[PDB]
Design an enzyme around this catalytic site. Structure first.
Site, PDB file in Angstrom:
ATOM      1  N   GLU A  51       0.730  -1.123   0.042  1.00 22.75           N
ATOM      2  CA  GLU A  51      -0.062   0.095   0.081  1.00 22.75           C
ATOM      3  C   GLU A  51       0.814   1.424   0.002  1.00 22.75           C
ATOM      4  O   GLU A  51       0.446   2.417  -0.557  1.00 22.75           O
ATOM      5  CB  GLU A  51      -1.106  -0.169   1.076  1.00 22.75           C
ATOM      6  CG  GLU A  51      -2.024   1.016   1.165  1.00 22.75           C
ATOM      7  CD  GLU A  51      -1.628   2.238   1.914  1.00 22.75           C
ATOM      8  OE1 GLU A  51      -0.705   2.310   2.946  1.00 22.75           O
ATOM      9  OE2 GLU A  51      -2.338   3.245   1.647  1.00 22.75           O
ATOM     10  N   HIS A  52       2.032   1.046   0.615  1.00 21.52           N
ATOM     11  CA  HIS A  52       2.840   2.344   0.651  1.00 21.52           C
ATOM     12  C   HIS A  52       3.561   2.443  -0.657  1.00 21.52           C
ATOM     13  O   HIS A  52       3.831   3.429  -1.494  1.00 21.52           O
ATOM     14  CB  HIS A  52       4.134   2.263   1.478  1.00 21.52           C
ATOM     15  CG  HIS A  52       3.524   2.526   2.887  1.00 21.52           C
ATOM     16  ND1 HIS A  52       2.487   1.904   3.572  1.00 21.52           N
ATOM     17  CD2 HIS A  52       3.955   3.482   3.672  1.00 21.52           C
ATOM     18  CE1 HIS A  52       2.271   2.464   4.847  1.00 21.52           C
ATOM     19  NE2 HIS A  52       3.169   3.509   4.939  1.00 21.52           N
ATOM     20  N   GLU A 128       7.150   5.374  11.254  1.00 25.66           N
ATOM     21  CA  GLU A 128       5.889   5.419  11.515  1.00 25.66           C
ATOM     22  C   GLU A 128       5.139   4.636  12.706  1.00 25.66           C
ATOM     23  O   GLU A 128       4.920   5.002  13.595  1.00 25.66           O
ATOM     24  CB  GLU A 128       4.937   5.437  10.373  1.00 25.66           C
ATOM     25  CG  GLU A 128       4.674   4.095   9.661  1.00 25.66           C
ATOM     26  CD  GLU A 128       4.042   4.230   8.514  1.00 25.66           C
ATOM     27  OE1 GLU A 128       3.130   5.223   8.482  1.00 25.66           O
ATOM     28  OE2 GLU A 128       3.815   3.039   7.718  1.00 25.66           O
TER      29      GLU A 128
END
Lengths: 401, 76
Positions: A51-52, A128
């Site tokens: 997804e990144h 993150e």
């Protein structure tokens, strides 16, 4: 008078669903039945890291030129991943409908994962996560999932453990991509100013290449005591019914009845024939036990004694909230994608209204006694949680003498 | 009271529901080894005082009896 959601199917199995409306901007998305539940602890962060990587360039559109295209029409590009579903959606104008679909086609197939990018996105993801711990409610809900679904693929988080994040390679990703991105497990959903025939022709033109190929609720508790935090977050849940079980609607009405702690939120998270139904509250240490007592009484009350009027309140409350039509395009489609992935069809709002109006007080307390009364909960606490009661007191508060 | 008892940090604590766990798991499986493990670690501190109590008690009894025993030379 709400327009119906029309669903077609390509040979690939990619159901192309659309719900036209006057609004001239549309939300076209791809949903995929692929999440952390389909990962096998050796690729626990593959969906998140893909997804990144999915917006960092494809084979046909190498690098930032791709996102230059989605800047050129002024469109917005979003993606998210849950434990069961992955979504890539674009909000754009109506007249830019073809190229957007073509863009989405690249994002699902022909995507390019650059090794250079892999290291950069690893540092992004790693960092993150290294700071994600900051968000308490996310920590508490991850703890609740882990202690409620111990030993199953539903305990593991969407992000995965830092370990896997560091230890991931193109080929692994390629696998997850080539394994969990099958055409029969994909929905192309469109909401707003779109024509269904034009969208079907665009799905036939591009995206017609996509290849065609239980859980156990461990009632238990996890408590991360850290007394330096100013506030405590506590989530208590029981096992939910699942997506296809209609008494979910009744349970939603029960949540609408509940709606002492600074923040009190009720949730009914549903996965494929399972789920978590409960409450999360964030409180000062010296109040925690009283909150819990309060909360258990309410639940027990509904299971024990619930009037007609409050039910009406919930019915109505849910109705307005359930109302999503023309709430937003992004929401609208999100609903089309989730409905085609979970139910296999788009449930119209009239059927939702019928299932709401058939709910009365007797079946609400029956279903609440079925799901709340004398059940073993999963408890997840984070913060100054010493006055949070242990499992016998909560389990004894799960029934009345 | 609870909430103001102590300050700990980063100590996660997992647990299970009573009805989800067997009542006496491996009871005699490990119970015996443990009880035996325990007895070893404490038997040398506990037992020898009571052993010498038993010796002193017997001794006292027998000595007392002999004491009560008539001197052969008595009244002869």
């Amino acid at each position: 008078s709400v327009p119906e959601t029309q669903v077609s199917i390509l040979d690939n199995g990619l159901r192309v669903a659309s719900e036209q409306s006057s609004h001239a901007t549309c939300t076209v998305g791809v949903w995929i039945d692929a999440g952390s539940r389909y990962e096998t602890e050796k690729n626990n962060g593959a969906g998140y890291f893909l997804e990144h990587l999915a917006f960092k360039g494809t084979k046909n559109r190498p690098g930032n030129a791709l996102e230059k295209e989605v800047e050129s029409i002024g469109a917005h590009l979003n993606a998210y991943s849950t434990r069961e579903h992955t979504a890539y959606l674009i909000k754009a104008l109506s007249k830019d409908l073809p190229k957007v679909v073509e863009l989405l086609a690249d994002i699902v197939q022909n995507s390019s994962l650059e090794d250079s990018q892999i290291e950069k996105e690893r540092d992004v993801i790693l960092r993150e996560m290294q700071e994600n711990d900051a968000s308490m409610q996310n920590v508490v809900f991850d703890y609740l999932h882990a202690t409620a679904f111990q030993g199953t693929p539903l305990a593991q988080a969407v992000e995965g453990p830092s370990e896997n994040v560091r230890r991931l390679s193109r080929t692994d990703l390629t696998d997850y991509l080539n394994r969990h991105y099958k055409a029969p497990r994909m929905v192309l959903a469109a909401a707003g100013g779109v024509e269904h025939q034009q969208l079907l022709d665009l799905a036939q033109k591009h995206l017609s290449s996509v290849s065609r190929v239980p859980c156990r609720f461990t009632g238990s508790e996890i408590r991360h005591r850290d007394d330096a935090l100013p506030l405590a977050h506590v989530a208590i849940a029981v096992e939910g019914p699942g997506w296809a079980n209609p008494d979910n609607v009744t349970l939603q009405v029960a949540n609408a009845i509940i709606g002492l702690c600074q923040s009190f939120q009720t949730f009914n998270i549903s996965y494929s024939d399972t789920g978590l139904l409960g409450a999360h509250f964030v409180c000062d240490a010296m109040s925690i036990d009283d909150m819990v007592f309060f909360l258990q009484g309410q639940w027990m009350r509904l299971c024990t004694s619930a009037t007609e009027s409050e039910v009406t309140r919930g019915k109505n409350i849910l109705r307005n909230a359930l109302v999503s039509h023309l709430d937003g395009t992004t929401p609208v489609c999100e609903d089309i994608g989730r409905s085609l992935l979970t139910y296999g069809r788009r449930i119209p709002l009239a059927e939702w209204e019928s299932r709401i109006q058939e709910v009365d007080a007797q079946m609400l307390r029956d279903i609440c006694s079925k799901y709340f009364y004398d059940q073993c909960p999963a408890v997840a606490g984070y913060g100054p949680i010493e006055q949070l009661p242990d499992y016998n007191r909560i389990r004894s508060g799960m029934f009345w003498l | 009271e609870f909430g103001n008892l102590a300050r700990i940090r980063h100590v996660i604590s997992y647990s299970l529901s009573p009805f989800e766990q067997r009542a006496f798991p491996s009871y005699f499986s490990k119970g015996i080894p443990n009880v035996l493990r325990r007895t070893r670690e404490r038997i040398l501190r506990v037992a020898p005082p009571f052993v010498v109590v038993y010796l002193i008690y017997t001794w006292g009894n027998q000595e007392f009896e002999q004491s009560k025993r008539k001197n052969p030379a008595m009244y002869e």
